[PDB]
Design a protein around this ligand. Structure first.
Ligand SMILES: *[C@@H]1O[C@H](CO)[C@@H](O[C@@H]2O[C@H](CO)[C@@H](O)[C@H](O)[C@H]2NC(C)=O)[C@H](O)[C@H]1NC(C)=O
Ligand SMILES: *[C@@H]1O[C@H](CO)[C@@H](O[C@@H]2O[C@H](CO)[C@@H](O)[C@H](O)[C@H]2NC(C)=O)[C@H](O)[C@H]1NC(C)=O
Ligand SMILES: *[C@@H]1O[C@H](CO)[C@@H](O[C@@H]2O[C@H](CO)[C@@H](O)[C@H](O)[C@H]2NC(C)=O)[C@H](O)[C@H]1NC(C)=O
Ligand SMILES: *[C@@H]1O[C@H](CO)[C@@H](O[C@@H]2O[C@H](CO)[C@@H](O)[C@H](O)[C@H]2NC(C)=O)[C@H](O)[C@H]1NC(C)=O
Lengths: 278, 525, 527
């Protein structure tokens, strides 16, 4: 019944043809059998058609879908993914989600559940949903924690902040707003910050954790999506920047929270929305 | 608590290398099936035939051969996936004949499982390839089951290269693709499947898994018996869409009595339905947990006692931190969950999609019965506990003995030893089970890890083909010559396959296998 | 990381090799316990307690120096026959022998299932004084175990109280106070236990036993290893809750496990040691097996006093519903003061006696007498195991300072089948790689003794000997056997026996050596 927990973008395919894929993420309130928490459904020019909102790849085993495991809801009852922002960048689509922490929260649903903000990224050209990847995000300034994501806007920084960061004129930037802490979410505390993440530094820390996996170090770490502590399998494959996953080493877990550059803090009258341009 | 039996006769290495072995680069044995008077051996890249009428010479020489190696790009995708070259080979893991001409074959295909149809007459690849997903394992080292009943194929394996989703999957029929709930730890959590059997309206399954009733301690392994309706078509749109609606499972009770009942809960292998003393039984081989004191037992159940459990009371966990307890008789929703549509307590239902939401959503969160299945005659039939090695392969001859009223069980081992045991089944049969022979059956020269994998009874040639990981050894059922002239040694062995003749030699089939009296018998040296 | 295997004995000693050892017998000997003071070993059996001078080197048989004679009276014998116990049982089996001071010894017998206690002088084993009632101080049956010990003038017993053998109790009496006891027939405090040992430490007395557990109730009827605790100064509860009953009675569980994916617990305790200084920290060392109806396995785990003490300041354990799983008592629900803390110490220091405890705290420890936490071992895995064999380990005894430099621990354990294992134990990270089973000896003497079950042991360091007790005979067994290797330089040092050493004279004598590794580097085969 809440709004604002759903987000997505439309991506019309090659012109002339009536299809437009549409990547949508939403919470499901534990009804994992009925509704996927994240899918890649299809669009058609004739609105009455029954193939509307149908997954762009479907078979009995993996689909352009992503159901919450019936296991994870049993280990902790009202777990859910709220989907704040989503933006198209390069040949991918990113989401900024906020999930219930599988760690800092005991299975007991007393009401002390903590949360963890995370970016997520897929490929537009990933029908089986192999390219999935998920890193926590946040920032700090003067030892004040800000880890409750609130809003985000993808903007081209124009010419000033570009040369300030060493980015080319076509590279984009994401401004963000984080609330203090990891507690409560339904009514976060006022203290909020406007932090900055470079699209570069995110594509880097990705090619860095998925290059670190295809070498066999560590393991994929998504305690809610994977359950069994699978290890990072070794592999003689050379990762690009535009590597869209394969049937192993996915969905891939983020180990170190990407830190952002703080630009502004307000400790009295809380921040809510954000946008930018040049 | 009992004690290890003493083998009446020991066959050591010197007395056993006089037995033929099969080979054909190595072999890497996987499974074996007996059809008519032919035995089929499936391994890496190869499937071999041995004609059971040809008395073997130094070696067992294969007659016909089937070959099905993994494709080239499959051999290189496997390398990119990080798996080693020795593993990237086509290990045949499924071999079930559909009719009396054609045989369903599946291979690992270097962690890219596919399935095919071969003809028995020729072993030729005829037709086109089918996908082996959810049907054949990715790893060769994993366990799996595969069976055909009434048109449709009942598989049971892992479905993904990463080895997370274990599923029971019916397809290859006129109906749809039904399956188990992925990741649902209450239904199945990290299992190793071992067998399956059709009986009545149900396909009964046998496997091991981590137990959820002994979670308030270590990661124990409990031996389970599950069942499914044959005519299940899945659930309605709300509950159990495309999923089984007939999934009940029970626990197996392999108990040494006493003040602290001692349980064996790791299932190693089991047989098909065998008529023992008039009633259909299944005979299985149980060990203890890995991080425990090595111990092994053979428990036997009956189809009756399996069925009785499932009409009994269901098991529920009232609250997260409470003990698994019974479901009230009033809370069992109508119709009887597990019962098959058009039969018994649900005959007012045309299909399994007609079932109420409360009956469906009950079996999805109480798939585990309460009761445990009793083993016939309380304690196990045989135990061997003091020794360093664990038990494995089982095989049974229901009609052993000159009168065919004696149950002789043949069991494998880890350290290449095989035990032949005359089992005490009924009360009026013996005082207890007696360990007839201990045969070391591993041939150091012709073979290499010496693990017996399975066995297959060749009752028509008085033999048993013991299977190892790289060799297969043809072992006669009786070394009656080891005794020969010595009538003392002979009938004192109580082996029903041997005996004493009036010609004055110990041969095969006058004997006394029941008590075994040493009366009126002299003393050879 | 997985499951241990049976260590291979570096040297074995068969019956022929140990019939060359002096023995002790006597009318059948019915040994129960021994004790060493100074240079004298008191041995208690049927009707009799013998003394043996330990300076006297035995020739062919250990002969007794003095002895103490005390048989059951005629009336006691007929009542014991009238009660319907066999005449072989209606004797006076000595079961308690505990010096109070340096002259007197508190001596109790079974007295044909009518327990009586007396005082004797030590020097002369002379009945000086009068009879004290032995009730709930000495058992009725000589097959039952019992614990007895004096501490600050008060006698701390542990046994069964009735002929019918149903009232397992822990008792204090004969003091300057009066008579505290556990609750009779209370399947919560203690349920059909077999008591093994007790020790006095700090403000409390700790007990070690085995009993029917209550956390393992969902499967079968199984026995766990417990460690209990009572205050020395405990005076009893008020007139409403625990009047004349213990108030500081806390018990916890002993975790003797093998780590893995599926932990394997040895839960049945067979014997234990007194407090021993093992490498800096005070230690106790226990011998643990598996259940009766089980595949015989035996283990020796060792715990620390710091680790026991911790579990009692830790959380309590409760069971919410009778059909719910045992649970941790919440911190904010413990009353005040801290139940099980002794009056006038730490937390009850605003309390003069234990009769001043609140009804909040008295009724809590009356129904929550078991701790939640278990006592872990040191090194978190047993110090030695024995599984693949058909017997069980019984008696335990240690040498806290073995070797030329005395920085190595050796442990001596008995067995049912009349075998005794000598283990050099690993006690610290920097020691050996694992604990190495040195010698395995068959001490039992079939021709001279008789079921051959070894009962208790006792180290006699000064004479380099371990006396080894059975039910029908006691055997005097020299520790080392350096003579068995003689001149074979290899054998002497690769046996790694810290007692044995290699000398310039070219022979293996007691106390040059290398017990650390045992390099048979530069050494040749002896024939
Ligand atoms: C496993 O099997 C044993 C063997 O029968 C069961 O033990 C008996 O259970 C009945 C049930 O009323 C008792 O009356 C008997 O007294 C038990 N046997 C003995 C020797 O006491 C045991 O209950 C079974 N356990 C499970 C979980 O099924
Ligand atoms: C298995 O069959 C044998 C042979 O019929 C049984 O042993 C015979 O029993 C008959 C009648 O019961 C006797 O007259 C013979 O003297 C027996 N012969 C021998 C060699 O023992 C045996 O009892 C049967 N066992 C069972 C369990 O039915
Ligand atoms: C018995 O002792 C073992 C040995 O330490 C315990 O195993 C550890 O348990 C703790 C918490 O219980 C874990 O954090 C460690 O990871 C365990 N260690 C290993 C090596 O696995 C065991 O839990 C103890 N059990 C009881 C009931 O006290
Ligand atoms: C126990 O004491 C022995 C003897 O003092 C120690 O072993 C010797 O240590 C010295 C000094 O490091 C070495 O030079 C010798 O080579 C060692 N000889 C032998 C026979 O061990 C030993 O290190 C001590 N152990 C501990 C744990 O302190």
């Amino acid at each position: 019944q809440e709004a604002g927990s759903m987000a997505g973008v439309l991506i019309a395919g090659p012109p002339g043809q009536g299809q437009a894929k549409l990547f949508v993420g939403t919470p499901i309130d534990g009804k994992s059998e009925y509704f996927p928490t994240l899918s890649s459904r299809r669009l058609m020019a004739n609105e009455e058609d029954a193939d509307m909102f149908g997954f762009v790849y479907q078979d009995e085993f993996v689909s352009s879908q992503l159901k919450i495991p019936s296991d994870t809801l049993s280990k902790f009852p009202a777990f859910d993914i709220y989907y704040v922002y989503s933006f198209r960048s390069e040949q991918f689509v990113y989401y900024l989600t906020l999930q219930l922490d599988t760690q800092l929260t005991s299975p007991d649903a007393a009401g002390e559940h903590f949360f963890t903000s995370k970016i997520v990224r897929l490929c537009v050209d990933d029908p089986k949903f192999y390219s999935y990847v998920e890193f926590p995000i946040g920032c700090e300034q003067a030892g004040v924690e800000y880890r409750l994501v609130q809003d985000a806007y993808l903007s081209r920084p124009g010419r000033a902040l570009a040369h300030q960061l060493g980015l080319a004129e076509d590279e984009d930037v994401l401004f963000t707003v984080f609330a203090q802490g990891q507690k409560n979410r339904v009514k976060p505390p006022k203290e909020s910050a406007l932090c900055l993440f470079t699209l570069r530094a995110i594509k880097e820390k990705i090619k860095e954790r998925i290059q670190s996996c295809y070498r066999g170090e560590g393991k994929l770490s998504l305690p809610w999506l994977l359950n069994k502590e699978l290890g990072c399998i070794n592999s003689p494959l050379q990762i690009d920047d535009d590597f869209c996953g394969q049937d192993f080493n996915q969905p891939l877990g983020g180990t170190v929270t990407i830190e952002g550059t703080p630009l502004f803090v307000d400790k009295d009258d809380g921040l809510t929305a954000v946008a930018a341009y040049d | 608590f009992p004690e290890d039996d003493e083998p009446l006769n020991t066959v050591d290495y010197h007395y056993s290398r006089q037995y033929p072995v099969f080979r054909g680069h190595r072999l890497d044995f996987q499974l074996m099936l007996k059809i008519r008077d032919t035995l089929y051996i499936a391994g890496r890249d190869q499937v071999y035939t041995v004609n059971l009428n040809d008395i073997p010479q130094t070696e067992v020489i294969p007659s016909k051969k089937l070959t099905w190696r993994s494709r080239q790009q499959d051999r290189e995708n496997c390398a990119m996936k990080g798996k080693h070259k020795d593993e990237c080979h086509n290990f045949i893991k499924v071999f079930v004949p559909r009719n009396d001409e054609m045989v369903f074959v599946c291979g690992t295909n270097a962690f890219n499982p596919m399935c095919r149809y071969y003809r028995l007459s020729t072993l030729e690849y005829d037709g086109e390839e089918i996908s082996g997903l959810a049907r054949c394992p990715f790893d060769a080292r994993q366990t799996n089951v595969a069976l055909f009943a009434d048109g449709k194929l009942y598989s049971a394996t892992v479905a993904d290269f990463l080895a997370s989703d274990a599923v029971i999957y019916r397809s290859m029929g006129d109906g749809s693709a039904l399956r188990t709930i992925k990741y649902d730890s209450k239904w199945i959590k990290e299992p190793h499947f071992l067998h399956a059997i059709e009986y009545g309206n149900y396909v009964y399954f046998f496997f091991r898994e981590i137990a959820v009733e002994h979670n308030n301690l270590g990661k124990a392994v409990y031996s389970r018996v599950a069942r499914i309706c044959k005519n299940d078509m899945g659930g309605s749109q709300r509950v159990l869409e495309k999923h089984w609606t007939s999934f009940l499972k029970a626990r197996l009770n392999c108990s040494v009595p006493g003040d602290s009942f001692f349980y064996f809960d790791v299932l190693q292998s089991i047989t098909d339905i065998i008529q023992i003393n008039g009633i259909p039984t299944v005979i299985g081989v149980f060990t203890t947990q890995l991080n425990s004191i090595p111990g092994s037992a053979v428990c036997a159940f009956g189809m009756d006692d399996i069925e009785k459990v499932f009409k009994g009371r269901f098991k529920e966990q009232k609250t997260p931190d409470s003990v698994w307890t019974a479901v009230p008789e009033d809370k069992v929703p109508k119709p009887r969950p597990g019962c098959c549509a058009k039969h018994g307590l649900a005959e007012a239902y045309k299909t399994s999609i007609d079932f109420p939401d409360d009956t469906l959503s009950f079996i999805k969160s109480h798939p585990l019965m309460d009761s445990a299945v009793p083993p016939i005659a309380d304690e196990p039939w045989f135990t061997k506990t003091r020794v360093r090695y664990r038990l494995t392969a089982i095989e049974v001859d229901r009609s052993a003995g000159p009168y065919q009223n004696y149950t002789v069980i043949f069991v494998g081992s880890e350290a290449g030893v095989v035990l032949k045991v005359l089992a005490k089944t009924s009360p009026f049969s013996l005082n207890d089970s007696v360990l007839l022979e201990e045969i070391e059956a591993y041939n150091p020269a012709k073979c290499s890890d010496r693990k017996v994998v399975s066995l297959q009874l060749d009752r028509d040639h008085h033999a048993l083909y013991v299977a190892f990981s790289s060799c297969v050894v043809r072992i006669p059922l009786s070394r009656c010559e080891r005794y020969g002239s010595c009538k003392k040694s002979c009938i004192a062995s109580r082996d029903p396959y041997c005996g004493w003749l009036s010609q004055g030699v110990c041969e095969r089939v006058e004997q006394d296998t029941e008590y075994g009296n040493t009366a009126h018998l002299g003393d050879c040296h």
